[PDB]
# Entry
Amino acid sequence: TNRADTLDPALLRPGRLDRKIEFPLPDRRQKRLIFSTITSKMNLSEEVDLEDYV
Amino acid sequence: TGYDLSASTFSPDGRVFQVEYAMKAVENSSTAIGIRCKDGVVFGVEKLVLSKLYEEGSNKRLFNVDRHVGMAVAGLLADARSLADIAREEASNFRSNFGYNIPLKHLADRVAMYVHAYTLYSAVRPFGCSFMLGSYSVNDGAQLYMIDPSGVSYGYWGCAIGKARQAAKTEIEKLQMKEMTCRDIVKEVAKIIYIVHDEVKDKAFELELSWVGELTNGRHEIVPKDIREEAEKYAKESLK
Amino acid sequence: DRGVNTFSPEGRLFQVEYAIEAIKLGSTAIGIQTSEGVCLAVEKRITSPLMEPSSIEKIVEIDAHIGCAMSGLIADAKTLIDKARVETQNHWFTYNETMTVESVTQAVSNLALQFGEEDSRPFGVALLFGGVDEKGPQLFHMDPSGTFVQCDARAIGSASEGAQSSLQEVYHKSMTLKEAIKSSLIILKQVMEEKLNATNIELATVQPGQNFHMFTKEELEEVIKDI
Amino acid sequence: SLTTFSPSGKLVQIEYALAAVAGGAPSVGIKAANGVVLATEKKQKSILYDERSVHKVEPITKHIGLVYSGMGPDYRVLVHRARKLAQQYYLVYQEPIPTAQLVQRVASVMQEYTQSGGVRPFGVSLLICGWNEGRPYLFQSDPSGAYFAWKATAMGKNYVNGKTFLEKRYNEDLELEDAIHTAILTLKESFEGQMTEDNIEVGICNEAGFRRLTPTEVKDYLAAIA
Amino acid sequence: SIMSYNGGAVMAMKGKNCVAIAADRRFGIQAQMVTTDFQKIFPMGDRLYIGLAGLATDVQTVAQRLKFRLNLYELKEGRQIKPYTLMSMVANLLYEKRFGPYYTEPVIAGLDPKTFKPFICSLDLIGCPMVTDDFVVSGTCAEQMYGMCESLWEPNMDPDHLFETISQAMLNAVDRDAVSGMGVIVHIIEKDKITTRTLKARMD
Amino acid sequence: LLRPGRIDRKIEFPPPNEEARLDILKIHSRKMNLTRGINLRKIAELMPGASGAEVKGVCTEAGMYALVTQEDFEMAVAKVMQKDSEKNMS
Amino acid sequence: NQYDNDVTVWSPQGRIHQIEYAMEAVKQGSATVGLKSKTHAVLVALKRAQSELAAHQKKILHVDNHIGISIAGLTADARLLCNFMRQECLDSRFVFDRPLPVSRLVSLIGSKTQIPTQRYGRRPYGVGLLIAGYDDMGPHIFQTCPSANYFDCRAMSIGARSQSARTYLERHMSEFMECNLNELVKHGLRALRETLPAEQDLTTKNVSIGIVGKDLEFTIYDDDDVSPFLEGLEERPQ
Amino acid sequence: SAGFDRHITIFSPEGRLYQVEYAFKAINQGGLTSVAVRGKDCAVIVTQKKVPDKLLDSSTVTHLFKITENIGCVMTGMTADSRSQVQRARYEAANWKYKYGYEIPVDMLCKRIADISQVYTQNAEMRPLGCCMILIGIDEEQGPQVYKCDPAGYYCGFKATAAGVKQTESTSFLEKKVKKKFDWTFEQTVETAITCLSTVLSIDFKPSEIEVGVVTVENPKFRILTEAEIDAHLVALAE
Amino acid sequence: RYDSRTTIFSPEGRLYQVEYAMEAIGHAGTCLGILANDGVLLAAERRNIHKLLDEVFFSEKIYKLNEDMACSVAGITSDANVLTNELRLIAQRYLLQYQEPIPCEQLVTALCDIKQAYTQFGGKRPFGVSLLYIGWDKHYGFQLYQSDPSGNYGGWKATCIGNNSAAAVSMLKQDYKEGEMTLKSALALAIKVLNKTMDVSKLSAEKVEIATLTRENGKTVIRVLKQKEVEQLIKKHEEEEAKAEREK
Amino acid sequence: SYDRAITVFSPDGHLFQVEYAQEAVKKGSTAVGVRGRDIVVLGVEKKSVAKLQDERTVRKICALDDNVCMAFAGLTADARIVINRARVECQSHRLTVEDPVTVEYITRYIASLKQRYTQSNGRRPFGISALIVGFDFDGTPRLYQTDPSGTYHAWKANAIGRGAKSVREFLEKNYTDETDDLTIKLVIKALLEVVQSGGKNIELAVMRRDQSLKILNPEEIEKYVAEIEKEKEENE
# Structure
């Protein structure tokens, strides 16, 4: 959810946290590949910029 | 509704609510207009008797700041008295330091800076006044200025301060203002003030008219309004 | 209301009304003007046997003919007494004469209600002033608010309602001295709680022919045993 | 506000100023054997701005360099204060002021602004350096009044990432040129992809004095330095 | 003069690798002496002394004020002080009383803290420094010590002949002087050690 | 309930420390076929009073990196211990 | 109502309520009436007491040889403005060696009371001045307010239940202008005997009259040159 | 966010302060547009007027304020802050002229005005003068200059400059226009200024609404154009 | 509840900023001094022991204040510069006034009055800094003092810093010494205390700091000693741990 | 009906903070003091030795003059300030008036300073209560006490600090009108009547109205406790 600070009092401790790996915001090269996905969801006929907004 | 206490603080949308509330304080005050002609500036204030307790000649909002400059205040009266004293002091410094009459632009800019300086800090409130400034000079002509409660000071041909701010300038602007000398403009201001609010909310009002221009040879004083008596014999002809 | 620099919607003194309330907790005192002279009395409310009775000040000496009594808070009274002593001496300096009691109390109430923390708090004491000016004897009563007035026989502090009522029962204009003294200590031992003896109360009488020694010292025992 | 401590923690208005520093433009500074290298990262918002008007790398004396990572409008204020103070030292002693004494007095000024209770702290972290008496120095300060001494450090966006690169890349013994090479490497690790003769702005400190490099030699050096 | 109120003479002389400073012992009012053990040469750190001549009030006052500022400097910075720094400090201290002037002529003589380089300088009553290579003098008597040191100085001097040269100069120029006499104290310092000798001067 | 007349003893659990942490270090490193011959004392110390089984979790983090040298457990605690981080507030 | 604490705060309807509260503090004083003829100005106030035995708190106080004020409200601010009034009088009496015109003095009073009504840290002055004076052009009857908006009249009345007094002043302000001192003063107390509830009557010891004249110096009277003023009356129309 | 209700000038969490970024649209309550351009040895200011009244004058609605004989400026935002900032600028330029004996360069003036705004920002209990100022001037050995001063105290200065209400669009047109490497032969500057305001506002109006302030290295005095020559430039770009 | 500023009292009555300055002391570097005649010593814990510093300062907690006095420090760091400069200036003004060194107790009470001036007034932050004192005089010899943010000062012989050091004071009481003035005994004791209380494994000498103050012939030299003797002290103490495991 | 500060009255007419700063005095260490006819005596309890320091600097009984003696309760820092200013004041009285300082003058000074400190803007009241014992005018023994309000209040015996009602109740039940031997034994009975009376935490100092302060030795007090126990056995 939007928050996780309301947590990790007993879930993240010796015994409970056995394989807990937070998954927050990543680096880049996603935005580009996401474009390549969502911009391909729309037409982008054959020649339409990608990086100018990357 | 959230943050409008101090005069230093801003809003979430970026304006000072103290200045707005002080601006609409003068809206409840008496109606005061002004207009210039090609050789003078004429003031006029709708002034009201309370019930029967006044003396018709007390607390006159037509002040007299310099030899050729006077005010036409409306709003809180004592604040206007203090501001008039500050204006007298500024004209005093200019007369003492340069030996000639103050130009109205420079006077208005000093007064606007003084009003702005009372709008700036958080210890003090903004002024609750809105007044007029007229002048005349042989090398400058007639000049009529205007100072809001915030401190924005620029020039007009005609203005109105009070309840009927729009409702005066609706028919102020249909005056052929350039081609008239001010001796016509006296009864013109008489009819303009007499149009607004004869009997509707209050019972009775009373007229004052200030007067500066070439005909006074550069002096500023109230008209001998009883001389030529130009309101009433035309006010009774302005109801039809 | 919180603060000495804000009025009420109606007519409340607040920073002063709470002081007029704070008077009421103090010990009582009764002074009575008579043309023969001004008499005055007070209650000490001695708590301990270790509480040495002559060290508690209620009647102090301002001038050779000007007495005093205090109320409520002790140290505001100490401030006003100190300054009052200083200023009468200044009057004697610049005039070779005695500052009259009305002028004394105007000089006190010039700053008896002048409390300002900027540009400190209002004082918490009621004062009874007696003296002999050129117009004979005078009895004077002020308040924290500086609203100073003459009173013929004023009672202060605790139980002052019944003090005023039973005082207005017995008092008139052509009273004598000793009659007023015993009438005062009758009101005292109706409003005090303990047994009246040599150590509870103290008198202060000033006469035009007996300007010096505005006090009775253990002849007060003889006065009490005459009731 | 600034007059009272927390129930247990620290001075939240100084922590927020440190966060505003950490949210600023990145920079890197390296102390080598003979000189100290400073380097900032100065991107214009548009293509309209000029690169000859505002200057990040700024000298305090002829042999003392100083960069920051924060707000220029406070930076210039405390720069002017440090100017006047260093010239007062040179009035008193007729000798160019040592960098430790500069950092003491600048820290005293910043501390005096952290005192109660109407002024805000600076949102500025300094990186002070100079070559006094042979051995060059490097002194980082902070809004809290504190100061440190570094061999190589960074401040700004991704200072943690740049610092973990500095721990791996840098060492004890280098020269000024190799220091500039690793400095533009660790600044190029975190900056945008287009890095030109104007996006960076680099001054050095030889023992012969402070030197603020030009776009000519900066463009000559960073023309694909590795 | 006001400089001749309590007498006084301070000589400092630079040698080859060492430096010698000497002064008189007499203290007294205009013609009446009091004692022969009045101190005018003070230690300011290691291998560096200062000499003060003129009104004794300004001597002790400026000496304590300078010790105040000196210890504040040596505690703010762990290193010891260079002599030019001390010279500039004394100049600033004297120039703060531009119109309220002390009546003193300070003489600084000390070694280098890093090397064995000697150093001498003198100042005026408003803070005018003067660095030389041979000798500086101060006090009431001037022309006597100028004639003696311009007669006797050599550029390259072993410390023994340095001691004897400053000894003969001080003895003859003091014995010709009237208001300054009654014994001589001599500090001859170097990198290795510090020597303080007192001479058998004429008690007349 | 805090009235002792309802429960006599009141015994918190002090987490393991250097001695205990090192013994449990050898323990949780027992069965996994690590890169044997490795200092576990620095691991116990790097645990600032870890909640007992945290040695097991660091073993899990280590083995994951290898998928067990001392460097494995080092990176294990590095994932574990980071935050605490973020100096510039000394 | 949480904006309704200090002088500095403008209201969202623009009416600073500290001024309104000071007005209401003025409304709880004693009744007093001032009115002028063409040649003589008379102000009459009402006394009260704390108890039966005590004396009455006075209202008409002297200022100068031709200036006298009435008062209502607070007494510390009353004596403060009294000392300032006497000070500014003896200031111009020293410098110009003339008696003061009244209008410039009351303008100085407004400019004095302006500062505690605009900055923070002083209260507006609870004050009830009724000023009678003589410049070259005859008697003047001015009144003040805690808002410093001083008025000139020909007959005013401030204090508790002073409105019936104002009705009397309405129905005799035409009659006021012609008469000499005696019936003028008894018109003033034919306002004060309606400033009172009808079940009690105005006695000697509770009333005070101060006359200033064009040739007559300002003088206060109490019970003895008021026993001449109290006769010449009939009862109220019961 | 806030939370803290941003009443005074403190630091909020993460990490900004809200007073100055509320002051940045006190310009936006002006309802006004300003454009400055530097291409070559000239520099051009253009700014329109919003006068709905015939009773109102036309000379005293001027926003171009001649600071000194070689330095001009234009103001937007609220008027009182602008005029007070202008008199501070004149006073400090005169202070330069008194202290240092020669005419002030336009850089030091912007630095001094920015420092005044920063001192007004650093210490609380004063409103931070919510107006924006654009300066122009000629300097020897540097040509013409165009500078911008922020209410925050962040000065900068650059080639094609715009502030007011609609200047994201103006800077979009000036990125799409100052990208071609042609010279700017002063009527190129006047034409691009008039047409950039004519494409941002899209009005194509009389010569009596905009004000044009120019300075050129042929007459280094600041100069305000007349209705005739404004009309001449407007019909000169009329094709 | 009754929080807002340093003034006024709480309803029992206690103080707010005093206890909270103490709880600002508790999370800081640990110091101590030892009972010794013919000398006195100091111990200190290195904050921020990261490898990319310089250590060119020779002193981060010690401040050699006059000539024959130094002082450790603990708490918020940058208030202490204001305090140390002012303290040096106080002692130096005393030396200017009398030409005799400051006898250290009126120095301590001067700094306590400086701190108490911000405890009483309003509204200012009180100094949340406790700090030690070693020194020598003509009237008592070697001394030890404990400044506190209230303005109270206690002359101890074995002192106390914050949350890391309650067990240190417990070891100092249970291992109390008297009569043995030998510096090496007190240093071995201090090594033992910092070995237990600090979490530095095997007591790396880069994480410690030791300065001493002895009386030498008329000088009262202050020995902020170097690292090699600390190394051989650690080796000596680990040999004493080998002596402690001779019981197996 | 709010909270802060020391400038506001209660809705029923009190000052909360004077009464609340009295509580810190009410919860402090005990110190008593009596006057004999020629020798005055007082002393504090709760030496509270923590086994490892000196205590010659923590002395709660000091002097301003050769005639007057101090004591306090409450917190000690306010006592340090008041004593520092009191020494200065006693010496400034010695500057003009050439008398030995009367006790009543210095108590009026302490109470006046304390009250003008309490009246002002946001200054925290001194939470102490001093005992000011001296004998100057014809060797007449006096002892006055103070209060955070600033009320000097002359007594003949006194008890402050923790459980002062019980201690003053013993002086009540002793205090006979009917000699420095009965006064020494009365001090012994008061310190035996202390809240703990451990025998070693007793600290007493006397003045014989011509001498200076005498700090006793805790072996003489041991024989005093022994003769008190002997009289307690003689009661049976």
About this structure: The longest helix of chain A spans residues 30-41. The helical segments of chain A are 30-41.
